[PDB]
Each structure stands twice: as C-alpha cells, then as structure tokens.
Scaffold this active site. Structure first.
Site, PDB file in Angstrom:
ATOM      1  CG  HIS A  10      30.709  -3.765  38.764  1.00  9.08           C
ATOM      2  ND1 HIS A  10      31.762  -4.715  38.841  1.00  9.08           N
ATOM      3  CD2 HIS A  10      31.230  -2.757  39.839  1.00  9.08           C
ATOM      4  CE1 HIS A  10      32.559  -4.374  39.438  1.00  9.08           C
ATOM      5  NE2 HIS A  10      32.516  -3.258  40.296  1.00  9.08           N
ATOM      6  CE  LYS A  35      32.287 -17.772  40.655  1.00  4.48           C
ATOM      7  NZ  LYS A  35      33.665 -16.970  40.968  1.00  4.48           N
ATOM      8  NE  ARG A  36      32.537 -21.673  50.930  1.00  5.27           N
ATOM      9  CZ  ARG A  36      33.518 -21.819  52.143  1.00  5.27           C
ATOM     10  NH1 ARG A  36      34.375 -20.835  51.970  1.00  5.27           N
ATOM     11  NH2 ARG A  36      33.595 -22.839  52.954  1.00  5.27           N
ATOM     12  CB  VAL A  37      29.312 -14.647  48.179  1.00  8.69           C
ATOM     13  CG1 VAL A  37      28.454 -13.249  48.250  1.00  8.69           C
ATOM     14  CG2 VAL A  37      29.282 -15.290  49.434  1.00  8.69           C
ATOM     15  CG  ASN A  38      26.334 -16.919  43.181  1.00  9.08           C
ATOM     16  OD1 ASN A  38      27.288 -17.401  43.686  1.00  9.08           O
ATOM     17  ND2 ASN A  38      25.700 -17.816  42.542  1.00  9.08           N
ATOM     18  CB  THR A  39      28.257 -10.197  45.476  1.00 11.62           C
ATOM     19  OG1 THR A  39      28.318 -10.997  46.715  1.00 11.62           O
ATOM     20  CG2 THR A  39      27.911  -8.799  45.889  1.00 11.62           C
ATOM     21  CG  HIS A 103      40.934  -4.470  38.322  1.00  9.62           C
ATOM     22  ND1 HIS A 103      42.102  -4.679  37.808  1.00  9.62           N
ATOM     23  CD2 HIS A 103      40.759  -3.080  38.447  1.00  9.62           C
ATOM     24  CE1 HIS A 103      42.386  -3.535  37.430  1.00  9.62           C
ATOM     25  NE2 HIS A 103      41.583  -2.548  37.654  1.00  9.62           N
TER      26      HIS A 103
END
EC number: 3.1.27.-
Length: 111
Positions: A10, A35-39, A103
């Site tokens: 996080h 990765k498609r989204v590294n948030t 998680h």
C-alpha cells in the site's frame, strides 16, 4: 504476506514521474511482460491500518479518501510498457488479517 513487504503493497509513496524505477523489483511483475495496472497508494501505512481494524480476518473499505497514485499501462512511448500516472480520491476495499491490511480486496465497491 507480511507487514514489511506489504509496506510496499500500500505505501509506494514515490512523488516522482517514474513508476518503473520505483517498482523495479520481482514483486511487481505478472506472466507476460509488465502489469496492466501498478496501482500504488500514497498515505501512511498506519492510517490504512486504522480502517482495517476489526478482527483477525475481515473486509473493510476506505470510504473517505486515502489518496491513490495509480500508474496504468496505457500506450505510446513503450519503455517497453508506458504508464500514465494520475492521483485522486482513493475509495478502495482493503482486507484485514492479524488486524493489519494483509491483503488488498481490490477497488472500493465491495460485498
């Protein structure tokens, strides 16, 4: 998982426009290329630890706003994967084990 490796989960608090150099690690890759989204989430890991405080296994969701920093794989300028960084309100769904967010449940909308 663990609290230290999750500290990155996080708290990838990097105020730079380079999402690859900050996520340069084997803990940020899928089975294809990138990765498609590294948030990432920009906020103190302890404030997030307060919204996930309930029992030793639960599902809570930051309804207020834990400001997120999302680098999404878009297109153009491939290096080799281009990322568009955008910060805004973070209404997301976190999961709690051992009382700490062990998680991520995913987006805000949760069951």
């Amino acid at each position: 998982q663990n609290w230290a490796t999750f500290q990155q989960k996080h708290i990838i608090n990097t105020p730079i426009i380079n999402c690859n150099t900050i996520m340069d690690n084997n803990i940020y890759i899928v089975g294809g290329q990138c990765k498609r989204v590294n948030t990432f989430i920009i906020s103190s890991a302890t404030t997030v630890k307060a919204i996930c405080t309930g029992v030793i296994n639960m599902n809570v969701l930051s309804t207020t706003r834990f400001q997120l920093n999302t680098c999404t794989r878009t297109s153009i300028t491939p290096r080799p994967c281009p990322y568009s960084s955008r910060t805004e309100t973070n209404y997301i769904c976190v999961k709690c084990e051992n009382q700490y967010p062990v998680h991520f449940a995913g987006i805000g909308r949760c069951p």
